[PDB]
Design a protein around this ligand. Structure first.
Ligand SMILES: *[C@@H]1O[C@H](CO)[C@@H](O[C@@H]2O[C@H](CO)[C@@H](O[C@@H]3O[C@H](CO[C@H]4O[C@H](CO)[C@@H](O)[C@H](O[C@H]5O[C@H](CO)[C@@H](O)[C@H](O)[C@@H]5O)[C@@H]4O)[C@@H](O)[C@H](O[C@H]4O[C@H](CO)[C@@H](O)[C@H](O)[C@@H]4O[C@H]4O[C@H](CO)[C@@H](O)[C@H](O)[C@@H]4O)[C@@H]3O)[C@H](O)[C@H]2NC(C)=O)[C@H](O)[C@H]1NC(C)=O
Ligand SMILES: CCCOC(=O)N1c2cc(CNC)ccc2[C@H](NC(=O)C(=O)Nc2ccc(Cl)c(F)c2)[C@H]1CNC(=N)N
Ligand SMILES: *[C@@H]1O[C@H](CO)[C@@H](O)[C@H](O)[C@H]1NC(C)=O
Ligand SMILES: *[C@@H]1O[C@H](CO)[C@@H](O)[C@H](O)[C@H]1NC(C)=O
Ligand SMILES: *[C@@H]1O[C@H](CO)[C@@H](O)[C@H](O)[C@H]1NC(C)=O
Ligand SMILES: *[C@@H]1O[C@H](CO)[C@@H](O)[C@H](O)[C@H]1NC(C)=O
Ligand SMILES: *[C@@H]1O[C@H](CO)[C@@H](O)[C@H](O)[C@H]1NC(C)=O
Lengths: 51, 48, 120, 128, 111
């Protein structure tokens, strides 16, 4: 049923190790952060901080 | 003292990006070492 | 720009009073230098984007303004005394999050209602 | 160890299409890779195409591309070669080949390029 | 396609002595050449794969080696059944546009 479209290509091995990556808000947006350690999922976090 | 997990370097993996089935090259010759932490578990409850 | 946010914890009255107070290494310091200019240029270009809208309702260059229009009790009725000493601005926003369009549409027509006085 | 039986010799006419089946037995069919190779009379082997059974994908030779499709069915566990636009000099002996590549069902795959197991060899002669 | 030329193409050595067969690669095939033996009458048989690794159920007297553009298969002692056509097929390229060899020719010495 589903058209299995082969996309055959070249597959050379290469070094692949994760590196840290920050995600930042541009031009007028701010990223909150719950500095509180005991976290519960939803709910209040009376230790918030903007970064 | 040390608990071990036996495993293989698979090739035909299901892509985590979407519904697919990739296939990669045979593993290289040499030592492939990775000393990595474990900071998480994913669990689910029993059916009944 | 967004530095005028630490007052959020301060309550309604505290925010009201504080309103009038104020409203290679080289390459890393340049590509991240521009990203600080795109914030301030947007800060002014939004300041002029909303001060002009304030010029529709009548008052421009005013931190605190008030026009000729009553307040419907359907807009989350509650006494002014309690909603000005222990009340958060975010909570006020959430309480009136649906009615802002109504207010912002009727303010313009009220300003034109006043404008007819000198238009006559 | 594991034998493959190919279909009988078939004779057709130019402008038609031909189909030849190679059936593999002895192991699990789906855990194999199959290469179709042809030999002209008095000429060296000619690599026609390849198919990965676990994955159902084929790659054919460029100069021969466009007139050959290689398919396979795991239910009956056999691989079919289909050739279009038959023409005289294409008279030749056709060979299926199969190679074991590891535990393919679970995810393991070697992708060997050589040929180990072979069919008996069908003969196709297209002429007047 | 991919061309495969060899110089010298073939040399004449009388049967009865040790003989080595040389396969030349147009491209840089690391160890991806296999050797097949075809006596006339049926399908060929793989002997060396990986350019060095012996196939299962084949005599160990045959010895293949080489890399890059130069590969050589050597016999120790000739056998009655070791007079066939030897094909060297490379499979280094990907996608698999593999190309076979040309075989080796031996002439009947009729007096
Ligand atoms: C969780 O986190 C951990 C740690 O945070 C991660 O663990 C890391 O995983 C990566 C992925 O493999 C490891 O990288 C590997 O490191 C090998 C060791 O290299 C270091 O030591 C050597 C000693 O000789 C030094 O020379 C290196 O420094 C320099 O190395 C080259 C040498 O030319 C220089 O050019 C560089 O500029 C460096 O400055 C390192 O300090 C390293 O050998 C390895 O690289 C080989 O392997 C990769 C794998 O594909 C190849 O692509 C690559 O080309 C190299 O190939 C060699 O090995 C293969 C076989 O293995 C041969 O076939 C080749 O011919 C060749 O010999 C790679 O870079 C990293 O070390 C490791 N961290 C630690 C602390 O151990 C986890 O990945 C991460 N994630 C998870 C899920 O756990
Ligand atoms: C569409 C994007 C979200 O992806 C899913 O929907 N996936 C999903 C969801 C569920 C349901 N549980 C919530 C179960 C299983 C899967 C599948 N997961 C993986 O294939 C997987 O993890 N592969 C992998 C491979 C290599 C490394 Cl190293 C690795 F770290 C992980 C996958 C479905 N993709 C498929 N069937 N082709
Ligand atoms: C986690 O949050 C839910 C959401 O209200 C709450 O019901 C639950 O008690 C919390 N669990 C804790 C705080 O351990
Ligand atoms: C594991 O945790 C320790 C302690 O936090 C840290 O020093 C180490 O770098 C971590 N491992 C990795 C691979 O980051
Ligand atoms: C926080 O709220 C309390 C009310 O209990 C008040 O006394 C205190 O001054 C406030 N602090 C700040 C920084 O707003
Ligand atoms: C609101 O405040 C006024 C103060 O005049 C008081 O009379 C009234 O009872 C209050 N109502 C509520 C619901 O707190
Ligand atoms: C705003 O409207 C949404 C749906 O239109 C409703 O769920 C929400 O309760 C409303 N807000 C208030 C404060 O009534």
């Amino acid at each position: 049923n589903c058209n299995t479209s082969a996309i055959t290509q070249a597959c050379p091995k290469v070094s692949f190790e994760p590196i840290p990556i920050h995600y930042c808000a541009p031009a007028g947006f701010a990223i909150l952060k719950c500095k509180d350690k005991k976290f519960n999922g939803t709910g209040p976090c009376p230790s918030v901080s903007t970064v | 003292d040390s608990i071990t997990l036996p495993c293989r370097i698979k090739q035909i993996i299901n892509m985590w990006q979407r519904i697919g089935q990739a296939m990669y090259a045979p593993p290289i010759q040499g030592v492939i070492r990775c000393v990595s932490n474990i900071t998480g578990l994913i669990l689910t409850r029993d059916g009944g | 720009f967004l530095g005028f946010l630490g007052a959020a914890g301060s309550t309604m009255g505290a925010a009201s009073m504080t309103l009038t107070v104020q409203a290679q290494h080289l390459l890393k310091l340049t590509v991240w230098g521009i990203k600080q200019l795109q914030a301030r240029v947007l800060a002014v270009e939004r300041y002029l984007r909303d001060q002009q809208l304030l010029g529709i309702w009548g008052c421009s260059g005013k931190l605190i303004c008030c026009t000729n229009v009553p307040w419907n009790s359907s807009w989350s009725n509650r006494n002014l005394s309690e909603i000005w000493d222990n009340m958060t601005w975010l909570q006020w926003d959430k309480e009136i999050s649906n009615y802002t369009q109504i207010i912002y549409g009727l303010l313009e027509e009220s300003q034109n209602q006043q404008e007819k006085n000198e238009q006559d | 160890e594991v034998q493959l039986v190919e279909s009988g010799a078939e004779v057709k006419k130019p402008g038609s299409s031909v189909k030849v089946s190679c059936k593999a037995s002895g192991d699990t069919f789906i855990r194999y890779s199959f290469t179709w190779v042809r030999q002209a009379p008095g000429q060296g082997l000619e690599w026609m195409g390849r198919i990965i059974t676990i994955l159902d994908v084929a790659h054919y030779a460029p100069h021969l591309q466009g007139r050959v499709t290689i398919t396979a069915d795991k239910s009956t566990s056999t691989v079919y070669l289909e050739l279009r636009n038959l023409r005289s000099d294409d008279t030749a002996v056709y060979f299926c080949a199969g190679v074991y590549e590891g535990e393919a069902d679970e995810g393991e795959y070697d992708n060997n390029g050589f040929l180990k197991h072979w069919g008996q060899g069908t003969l196709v002669t297209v002429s007047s | 396609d991919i061309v495969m030329t060899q110089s010298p193409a073939t040399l004449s050595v009388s049967p009865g002595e040790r003989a080595t067969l040389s396969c030349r690669a147009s491209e840089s095939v690391s160890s991806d050449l296999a050797w097949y033996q075809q006596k006339p009458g049926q399908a060929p048989r793989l002997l060396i794969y990986g350019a060095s690794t012996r196939a299962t159920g084949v005599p160990a007297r045959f010895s293949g080696s080489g890399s890059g553009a130069e590969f050589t298969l050597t016999i120790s002692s000739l056998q009655s059944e070791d007079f066939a056509v030897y094909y060297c097929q490379q499979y280094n390229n990907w996608p698999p546009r593999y190309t076979f060899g040309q075989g080796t020719r031996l002439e009947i010495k009729r007096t």
